[PDB]
Amino acid sequence: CPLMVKVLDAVRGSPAINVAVHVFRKAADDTWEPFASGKTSESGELHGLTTEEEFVEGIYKVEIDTKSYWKALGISPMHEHAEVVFTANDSGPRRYTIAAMLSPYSYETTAVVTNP
Amino acid sequence: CPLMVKVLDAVRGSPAINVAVHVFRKAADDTWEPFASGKTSESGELHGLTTEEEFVEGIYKVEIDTKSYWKALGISPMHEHAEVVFTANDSGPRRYTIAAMLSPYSYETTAVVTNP
Amino acid sequence: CPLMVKVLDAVRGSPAINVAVHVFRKAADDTWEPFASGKTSESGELHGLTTEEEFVEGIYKVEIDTKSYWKALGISPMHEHAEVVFTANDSGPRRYTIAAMLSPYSYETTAVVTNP
Amino acid sequence: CPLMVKVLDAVRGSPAINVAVHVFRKAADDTWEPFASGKTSESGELHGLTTEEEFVEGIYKVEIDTKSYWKALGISPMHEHAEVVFTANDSGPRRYTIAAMLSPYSYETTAVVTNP
Numbered sequence: 005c006p007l008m009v010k011v012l013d014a015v016r017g018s019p020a021i022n023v024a025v026h027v028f029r030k031a032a033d034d035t036w037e038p039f040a041s042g043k044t045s046e047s048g049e050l051h052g053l054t055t056e057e058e059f060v061e062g063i064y065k066v067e068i069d070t071k072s073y074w075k076a077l078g079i080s081p082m083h084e085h086a087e088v089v090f091t092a093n094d095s096g097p098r099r100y101t102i103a104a105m106l107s108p109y110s111y112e113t114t115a116v117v118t119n120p
Numbered sequence: 121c122p123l124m125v126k127v128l129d130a131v132r133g134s135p136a137i138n139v140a141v142h143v144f145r146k147a148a149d150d151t152w153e154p155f156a157s158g159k160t161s162e163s164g165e166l167h168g169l170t171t172e173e174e175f176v177e178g179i180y181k182v183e184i185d186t187k188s189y190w191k192a193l194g195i196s197p198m199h200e201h202a203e204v205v206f207t208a209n210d211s212g213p214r215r216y217t218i219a220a221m222l223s224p225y226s227y228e229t230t231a232v233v234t235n236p
Numbered sequence: 237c238p239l240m241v242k243v244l245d246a247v248r249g250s251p252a253i254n255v256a257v258h259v260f261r262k263a264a265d266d267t268w269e270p271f272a273s274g275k276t277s278e279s280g281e282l283h284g285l286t287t288e289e290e291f292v293e294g295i296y297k298v299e300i301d302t303k304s305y306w307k308a309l310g311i312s313p314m315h316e317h318a319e320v321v322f323t324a325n326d327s328g329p330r331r332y333t334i335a336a337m338l339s340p341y342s343y344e345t346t347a348v349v350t351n352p
Numbered sequence: 353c354p355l356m357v358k359v360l361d362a363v364r365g366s367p368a369i370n371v372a373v374h375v376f377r378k379a380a381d382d383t384w385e386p387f388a389s390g391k392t393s394e395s396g397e398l399h400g401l402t403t404e405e406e407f408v409e410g411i412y413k414v415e416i417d418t419k420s421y422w423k424a425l426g427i428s429p430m431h432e433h434a435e436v437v438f439t440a441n442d443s444g445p446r447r448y449t450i451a452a453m454l455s456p457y458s459y460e461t462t463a464v465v466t467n468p
Contacts, residue, residue, distance in 0.1 A: 012451075012462065012464060014246075014339055014341060014342045014462060015247055015339060015340070015341070016341065017314060017340070017341030017342070017462060017463050017464055017465050018464060018465060018466060019464070019466065063200065082206050082207065082231045082233075082249060083204065083205060083206055083231070084179065084205045084206065084207065085205060087203055087205075088199065089199060089200045089201060089203075090198050090199055090200065091198065091200065103360075105342065105460075105462065107246055107247060107339070108247070108249070109230055109231050109232075109233075109246060109247070109248065109249030110228060110229065110230040110231075110246045110249070110337065111228070111229060112226060112227070112228045112453075112460065113226065113227060114225055114226040114360065114362060114365060114453065115198045115199070115225050115226075115365050116225075116360060116365055116366060116367070117198075117225075117365050117366060118366060118367065128335075128346065128348060130346060130362075130455055130457060130458045131363055131455060131456070131457070132457065133346060133347050133348055133349050133430060133456070133457030133458070134348060134349060134350060135348070135350065198365060219244075221344075221346065221458065223362055223363060223455070224363070224365070225362060225363070225364065225365030226362045226365070226453065228337075228344065230244065230246060230249060230337065231249050232244060232249055232250060232251070233249050233250060234250060234251065295432065314438050314439065314463045314465075315436065315437060315438055315463070316411065316437045316438065316439065317437060319435055319437075320431065321431060321432045321433060321435075322430050322431055322432065323430065323432065341462055341463050341464075341465075342460060342461065342462040342463075343460070343461060344458060344459070344460045345458065345459060346457055346458040347430045347431070347457050347458075348457075349430075349457075
């Protein structure tokens with residue numbers, strides 16, 4: 005798993021289950037090329053987005069669609085969405101975990117990088 | 121001041137001085153219309169972005185260009201930039217403060233809303 | 237103002253008004269000596285805690301009593317309180333702002349340091 | 353594992369390896385009774401702190417000793433330590449994950465609660 009996404013609901017203190025996550029890769033011609041997508045599991049984690057073969061060097065955008073998750077919980081949020089736009093494998097491949105804590109008014113993201 | 125932006129350097133624990141900030145307003149035809157821009161002052165704050173007359177209801181994007189600020193401090197960051205995309209004045213006008221704590225690998229944003 | 241405290245309610249996205257704040261200074265004999273205290277104002281800020289004469293070098297604890305603030309809003313929180321324990325004026329006097337974002341389950345603090 | 357602790361180094365974007373963690377349980381006579389302790393592993397996680405039999409209802413303090421971890425990395429930090437003081441099993445037993453993102457000047461904690 006070269007890329008994992010984990011989402012927490014910071015208001016309720018619990019994993020954010022079934023949040024949509026889309027990943028894009030910046031193309032040669034400056035456009036956002038769709039790369040992979042999925043939904044967080046009951047642990048708040050999304051595995052299997054990509055492979056070590058597919059996950060090349062690049063600029064990657066991770067869009068987490070928070071708006072609809074709050075609606076299932078009866079909330080209208082402030083942020084439309086959350087984004088993490090980071091450069092990947094710039095110096096050889098890494099394992100990346102994009103971590104997101106959400107709220108109706110705040111959000112942290114962190115890119116946690118390790119090696120295999 | 122219906123809209124203020126404040127940026128902190130969470131690594132050094134100090135205001136983030138002279139960071140570029142661009143604000144856009146989602147247009148009728150789904151495009152990001154440029155709205156206002158500026159640079160943070162020595163307190164890390166950016167005032168005078170807009171007026172109560174200009175700052176209508178809408179979906180607004182605040183782009184904080186972190187990448188170049190780290191370069192002036194000798195750092196290559198992970199995130200290309202930071203964004204806050206929020207809906208404004210949805211229920212009458214408010215005062216908004218978008219607050220940003222930055223790092224080479226993490227970032228919080230919060231939308232702090234009050235009335236006049 | 238060598239020491240300022242600012243508290244935000246990260247759940248509601250607004251200043252945290254009338255939160256109790258106690259500051260202690262580590263004494264010579266390892267004990268927490270009471271130093272100053274107050275309540276946040278309508279901006280979420282607490283000014284006038286101390287003076288440049290009184291605010292000597294030391295280890296200082298800032299206790300923010302979150303539990304009772306949530307009760308006034310009908311909430312039972314997870315954290316009993318929030319604390320920031322930091323060393324001050326270690327290399328000459330500074331201005332310190334202790335910043336706190338709260339929630340029933342999460343909390344950031346940051347020590348933001350500047351000079352006069 | 354009714355109680356797990358995970359620590360991230362938010363400055364370097366990586367797990368915080370071999371951080372000391374002490375847990376205390378508030379005793380009947382208002383004192384902090386030592387409960388369990390350990391060191392984070394290479395993933396930044398600390399497992400096996402306690403058992404479902406030992407981890408009763410109570411007020412628990414988790415002390416993460418950040419100061420010495422920065423020293424191994426050549427840093428003098430601002431915060432002496434990080435603490436999370438939370439009430440546990442108040443309404444039946446839960447699984448708790450205390451999550452910590454650290455820095456020389458900032459720190460988040462979150463209590464992430466789930467059921468088995």
